Write the structure tokens for this entry.
Amino acid sequence: IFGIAFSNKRWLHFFMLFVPVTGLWMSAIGVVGLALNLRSYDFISQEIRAAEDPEFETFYTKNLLLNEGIRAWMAPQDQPHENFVFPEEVLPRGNAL
Amino acid sequence: MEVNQLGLIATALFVLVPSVFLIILYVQTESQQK
Amino acid sequence: MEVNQLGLIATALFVLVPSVFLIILYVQTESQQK
Amino acid sequence: METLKITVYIVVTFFVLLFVFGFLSGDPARNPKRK
Amino acid sequence: METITYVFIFACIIALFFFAIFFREPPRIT
Amino acid sequence: LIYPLGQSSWFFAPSFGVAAIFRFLLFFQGFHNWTLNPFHMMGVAGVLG
Amino acid sequence: TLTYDDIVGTGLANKCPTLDDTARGAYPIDSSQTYRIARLCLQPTTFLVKEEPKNKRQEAEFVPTKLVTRETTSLDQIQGELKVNSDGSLTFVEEDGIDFQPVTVQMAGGERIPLLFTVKNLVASTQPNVTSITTSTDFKGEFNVPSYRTANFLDPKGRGLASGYDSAIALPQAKEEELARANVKRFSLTKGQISLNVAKVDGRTGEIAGTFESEQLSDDDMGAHEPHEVKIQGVFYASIEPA
Amino acid sequence: ELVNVVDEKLGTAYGEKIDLNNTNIAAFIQYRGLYPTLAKLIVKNAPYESVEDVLNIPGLTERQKQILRENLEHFTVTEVETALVEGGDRYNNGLYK
Amino acid sequence: AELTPEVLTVPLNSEGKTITLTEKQYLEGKRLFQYACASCHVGGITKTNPSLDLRTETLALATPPRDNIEGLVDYMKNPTTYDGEQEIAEVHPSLRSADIFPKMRNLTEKDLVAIAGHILVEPKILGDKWGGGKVYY
Amino acid sequence: IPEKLAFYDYIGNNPAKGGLFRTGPMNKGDGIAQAWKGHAVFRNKEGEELFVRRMPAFFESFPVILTDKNGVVKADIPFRRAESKYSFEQQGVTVSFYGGE
Amino acid sequence: ANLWERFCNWVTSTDNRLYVGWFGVIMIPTLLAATICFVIAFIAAPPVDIDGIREPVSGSLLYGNNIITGAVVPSSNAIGLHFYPIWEAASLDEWLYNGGPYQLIIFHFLLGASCYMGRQWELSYRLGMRPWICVAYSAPLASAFAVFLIYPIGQGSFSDGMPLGISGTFNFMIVFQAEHNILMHPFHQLGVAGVFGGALFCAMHGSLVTSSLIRETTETESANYGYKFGQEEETYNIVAAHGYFGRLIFQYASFNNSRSLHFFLAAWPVVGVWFAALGISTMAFNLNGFNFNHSVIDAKGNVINTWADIINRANLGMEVMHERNAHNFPLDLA
Amino acid sequence: LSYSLGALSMMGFIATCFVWFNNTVYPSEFYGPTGPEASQAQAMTFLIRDQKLGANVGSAQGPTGLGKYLMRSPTGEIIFGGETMRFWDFRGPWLEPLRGPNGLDLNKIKNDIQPWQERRAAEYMTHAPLGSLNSVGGVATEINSVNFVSPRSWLATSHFVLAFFFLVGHLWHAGRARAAAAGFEKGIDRESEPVLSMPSLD
Ligand code: CLA
Ligand code: CLA
Ligand code: CLA
Ligand SMILES: CC(C)=CCC/C(C)=C/CC/C(C)=C/CC/C(C)=C/CC/C(C)=C/CC/C(C)=C/CC/C(C)=C/CC/C(C)=C/CC/C(C)=C/CC1=CC(=O)C(C)=C(C)C1=O
Ligand SMILES: CC(C)=CCC/C(C)=C/CC/C(C)=C/CC/C(C)=C/CC/C(C)=C/CC/C(C)=C/CC/C(C)=C/CC/C(C)=C/CC/C(C)=C/CC1=CC(=O)C(C)=C(C)C1=O
Ligand SMILES: CCCCCCCCCCCCCCCC(=O)OC[C@H](CO[C@@H]1O[C@H](CS(=O)(=O)O)[C@@H](O)[C@H](O)[C@H]1O)OC(=O)CCCCCCCCCCCCCCC
Ligand SMILES: CCCCCCCCCCCCCCCC(=O)OC[C@H](COP(=O)(O)OC[C@@H](O)CO)OC(=O)CCCCCCCCCCCCCCC
Ligand SMILES: CCCCCCCCCCCCO[C@@H]1O[C@H](CO)[C@@H](O[C@H]2O[C@H](CO)[C@@H](O)[C@H](O)[C@H]2O)[C@H](O)[C@H]1O
Ligand SMILES: CCCCCCCS[C@@H]1O[C@H](CO)[C@@H](O)[C@H](O)[C@H]1O
Ligand SMILES: [Ca+2]
Ligand SMILES: [Cl-]
């Protein structure tokens, strides 16, 4: 069906331990980096291109626009100790919405 | 695109060093007495 | 010094590829029934 | 574009006909037990 | 150079698929 | 533990609740772009795999 | 008589009406009567773009392009006053209508050239002494070509003129001077020129049809780059009426 | 120096009052009596060389003229800005709530 | 904080007369506003025309003034544009167009007062959220 | 004010402002620091002192909002312009430098 | 026999290295077409006007993407649900601008993957197997149909299909959250339970079997050599594993029946993922997550925010920014 | 049973699309507007409003360069603009009076829109079939107030769920019926295991 198959039951069951255990451990390491804001936030080459070329657009640039909306719209209520006041005029919004 | 100039060599060695480690170990296993 | 940006990858692969070829061959010679 | 469309129409018809006639060719019998 | 690298890794993986299917260690009963 | 310890306070740890955890996901997207992170991607591969 | 459901999805909705070969008539103008164009339609059949060569001394040519935005290019339902001037020339003053279409065409090699194909604020005049509109009447005039994107349009990094960021926010500590042209959006307004050459007249219905040629600039992406020169050719139809 | 013409306009009287030559029509809701009837006429008949010219619109009722007179002090005129008047933007400038 | 008689005390007319609404009337006003009006005026905005909201300051500058029970009750019988210049019953629910807006058919005078009382009370509770739109959600 | 002290009061030196794949020295990002420009004091047309709201470490990007000494908003840099009330143009915002270059 | 008969015999042969079969006669060409078009577009396709507003988005490697940002971009919003094959275009250049490759790929892929599922039934029947592995695969397949076909149908456009790309996928997720509040939808919550629980039971089963392997090897050899392909004897002690797990929790919380255990292993993720798929497929018709925005109100009528309202604020950020030049009117209705 | 399960699955899917798109045998007077209908009704609503305010809706260029109110379909027909461009195949009684052989007619638009069309378009825009599982009508970010989920959403979603699980039951039962007819539905005979009689793949 698939081109390959298990032939060793012992290997099969060890692999079933391996895969989700390893995946959770990898996610933990990324979160340790996020503890420091050490993010994979950007691709610098994408930003340099998009800053100079206003016709260059990718799904990566589209998603940062969404992030910027999330930060501005959610921060004042989500981070009350900051006492954010964001006058309507500064909130990022596209057309109409 | 203005990429990191070390991207290429980092990527190349990332592939080559452990792939060659594995190939060395595979071939000398095959060459062991049948 | 403004060196050619491919000189590093060229040298590394120049070294690595044939050296690895010889290491593969040597180790699988050693592992042969002696 | 006209030639391409006619080509694809022919190709698809050809394969659909294999699927239909194929499954019509005594499919239940093609198993390892009772035929 | 990056496009070349990405397509090169991809091509190695498709080649690997080919050897892993058609030049696998054949399963032998017992 | 580690995540809030790296941040300013426990306030930024996840709160223990269903909607509260949803909020934690969306915060990580808007502030950390956490979906872009290759350690999260490997997590997702090990969970779905 | 054709209904929407006869027409829908055929491409005919992007076609201007045509006149019969018998339509070689003459439409009298009474200099005491006021008139309008009740419907002007312009269907482009070729878009040409002037190449930009590496040196002066050879004049660049207009070269053919490939349309990539489908059958969405015609101007239609345009109307306005048709003035009789005191030398017997007529002047059309465009009032309203579907008087623009964004269009993207592609040069050989793939460079995409968006433009606002348009006759906005068109003022076009005939030769003097047009006692009748005939197959020898021509209109020549000028129109405005506003920015292809209007002032709210936001680029892929969120920058805009009447909305948007005013800087490259992903490069918080980059020097701003080298990015001024991309950061500070500008709204262009330039002039275009058009000629209409009457080829057919039905003297009895007020209808004319012919060929046109316009010249205008393409999109400059809110000031980010230099626009190209475009030459559009097609057929037109107009219905003239007393008003 | 390249200049954002909308920002520059915010430094003129357009930034202070209803600019009969430029301001989007919803701005006439700020004062009693202006919208929609007079707002439509005022935008339809723009531009005006001075604020008083607004009284020269044809067909006005006497009550309509008095409402204008009462509101001239809330009006200004500045040069027409193409970026504010194209795209039908005086009638709908893509801003809702 | 409580829904007190003071919060429930709103302008009855243009002349400065007030009326104190009961809690039953407050409940009834919310219920009936949801019933007949909220499909377009949820939260004090207007979905089909966002330039006009139900804020008290906006109502005060309408013609005739709509920032009181009388002005709101009259709006619900014979709605006009914001300048008082056209009658818009044909496109806005009212008692006079209950034939084409059937939900108006069984609204009594008492019901109109309750709905008008909701419009004046809600911003005293919600402040800028009333008529604010999504920014204030 | 020693330049060294001023330099510690700058987010470019905050270690929680990085990226996992933004490699190398801090100097590679904002650049090699040369000199303090001096302390910027912002004022509106009335001459009242205004304060720029600082970016918290969480935010890759942050709007420009100026408040008076009591935290009331007095000026900002709008996104949408058509309903702008607090632009630097409207409020006559100026900036004066004390100390530094 | 005749040519046809021998052909059928070959197509249905249990002896081919890769099973062909009648489903395979459709699957092979359709998967090959989708794969080839996908690889070529992902490398070399020019920018695609996904939202029909003449704002082309670059998906391919040669046009400035990397593996993470690259995508085959959905077809233009101007197209909607209209069928846009190559021959409907005036040129390949137009076809490319309008996102023709996306339709070609996804239609061939969906047909091919549905045939992959049929083929799984087919081979199981040729081999004298029980038939329901193909029912387990219906769960991922349903999910692919939800995001590439059902959702676009509900919303009236393939431009709202999931893009064929890593960042595109996240774009689809984030916009889906703004528009449907998926996190607050119980079918997506059941999907999370399905995939987190599938991971959990995968690790659990792997670890319980591995923990009770019968000693058959020395300390120098991998224990994997203690099992020989095709041996009759079970390779671990299930009574030992049950003995352990029944004590970890309590006796009746543990399976001692391997058939019941393996049924549970199949069922839990397959059912959860069917609900994931049905979550997307019903939010396709805008029956959305729970909305408790302003649900908690104090004695005066002040809104007392809950974590639901904080979600709402993040959703609003996504909503107001997404497709920033595509909306002219105040409601996003599809 | 299995053949019937497949057929009901298919019919379920068909019904889902019927209630979602069709407004003839599911009259919008009773079932609410379709998704395409409510989106078109919104554009109609603002065209009506802004043209009342004096906008020339035929010549109004939107931020993208496409007409803010009116644009062409890929075959040239005049259609509503903004996102609803996707819904230009929509047809309904309140809109058809405005449609001519070339699509939406600008002269009919400027002169012939009746108050009953404005009312219907406002009703349909504000009863779009979007709402939460607890029946809060509106987009997902809407505040509580309006208790609404369209009968169209309830009927489409329910029938898609049913049609899907009916496909699953079809596969379940069709594959079981095959296996039981051939005699291996209870498992593989340990002494007659077919794969043991077959040649190795390699
Ligand atoms: C395809 C979709 C997808 C998938 C499969 C995943 C998968 C994963 N996500 Mg990602 N996520 C996604 C999309 C996805 N995510 C998107 C789009 C975002 C937006 C950015 C996120 C944002 C996100 C965040 C913010 C986090 C994840 C994390 C994780 C990991 C959670 C592992 C886990 O089980 O923790 C569950 C918790 C545990 C395993 C801890 C132990 C739990 C004990 C044993 C519970 C005991 C309970 C007790 C018995 C009884 C309970 C009582 C009862 C009443 C409840 C996992 C790798 C997390 C991660 O990376 O952590 C390192 C994390 O913090 N995700
Ligand atoms: C504790 C270890 C450590 C730390 C904290 C530092 C810290 C630093 N170094 Mg030193 N360095 C180290 C060890 C370290 N280095 C070693 C061992 C070497 C020899 C290779 C160097 C050689 C070195 C040079 C030549 C330079 C530095 C520089 C720097 C600075 C920038 C670091 C940077 O950009 O990282 C970037 C970090 C990353 C991009 C993260 C890498 C994450 C890996 C790739 C993850 C791999 C995942 C794995 C494959 C997954 C497997 C999954 C599987 C299990 C299933 C910083 C002060 C730079 C500097 O500014 O010099 C003055 C500089 O030029 N370092
Ligand atoms: C075609 C089926 C169908 C549809 C489209 C509707 C539609 C509707 N009903 Mg009706 N109804 C139905 C069947 C249906 N109902 C049945 C079977 C009953 C008997 C219980 C009722 C009794 C009923 C009453 C008493 C009421 C309604 C009401 C309503 C409205 C609100 C529904 C709601 O709030 O849901 C809430 C949503 C749920 C409760 C979630 C249901 C999700 C289920 C549990 C998941 C199904 C998954 C799958 C089938 C299981 C497979 C398992 C797998 C392993 C194989 C809505 C118009 C209300 C109304 O407004 O009346 C005017 C109302 O008061 N219904
Ligand atoms: C043109 C170009 C360049 C195109 C490429 C474009 C593009 C977008 C490419 C994609 C890039 C890509 C792949 C990105 C993913 C990167 C990523 C996140 C990788 C994860 C890396 C990583 C190490 C993660 C850590 C977690 C981890 C270890 C995950 C492993 C996941 C994994 C492989 C799981 C198993 C998957 C799988 C299909 C197993 C099949 C097993 C099998 C044959 C079962 C059948 C079976 C069952 C039985 O029960 C029995 C009894 C038998 C006998 C039997 O046989
Ligand atoms: C200081 C002081 C006071 C000290 C006193 C301490 C003291 C002595 C106390 C004694 C008193 C006492 C006991 C008090 C109790 C206190 C108390 C109530 C604590 C709370 C404990 C708590 C919250 C427990 C959490 C509940 C819990 C563990 C739930 C588990 C839920 C769950 C999903 C169970 C799994 C059930 C299930 C269907 C499993 C199948 C899935 C699975 C594992 C598949 C894999 C698998 C399974 C097999 O089955 C076998 C075979 C094999 C092969 C295999 O692959
Ligand atoms: C409130 C009022 C009540 C109304 C009721 C509501 C209706 C809904 C209830 C549905 C009834 C379900 C009965 C199914 C029994 C069954 O499966 O039999 C099959 C086997 C037989 O059990 C095995 O039974 C065997 C004996 S025999 O086969 O039954 O003869 C025995 O050998 C073995 O040890 C034993 O485990 O059951 C098992 O293998 C144990 C696991 C069963 C639970 C999982 C199956 C269901 C799907 C998983 C849940 C997904 C949800 C999570 C989503 C992420
Ligand atoms: C219709 C035909 C469809 C054909 C599709 C092509 C399928 C390719 C399948 C994988 C081939 C490579 C396997 C190498 C590895 C290989 O040869 O494995 C073979 C190995 C065989 O297992 P055994 O039990 O025989 O192992 C004995 C062990 O004891 C040896 O120590 O199989 C597994 O381990 C299964 C689990 C891994 C399954 C990996 C899944 C990979 C999915 C692909 C992921 C990446 C995609 C990247 C995209 C750019
Ligand atoms: C576009 C769809 C096309 C619509 C076609 C409508 C089909 C309805 C009429 C069916 C007539 C076909 O009739 C069917 O044909 C096939 C192919 O020749 C026959 O022939 C087959 O017989 C045996 C049966 O075990 C097979 O092993 C053998 O490979 C094959 O030759 C079937 O035994 C016969 O029953
Ligand atoms: C083997 C598959 C080949 C894929 C061909 C890519 C399209 S062809 C390609 O198009 C580019 C943009 O138009 C041109 O700049 C370039 O000159 C041309 O080579
Ligand atoms: Ca002529
Ligand atoms: Cl829109």
Notes: Residues A 2-4, 6-8, 11-12, 15; E 10, 13, 16-17, 20; K 18, 224 surround 1,2-dipalmitoyl-phosphatidyl-glycerole (ligand 7) (CB under 6 Å).
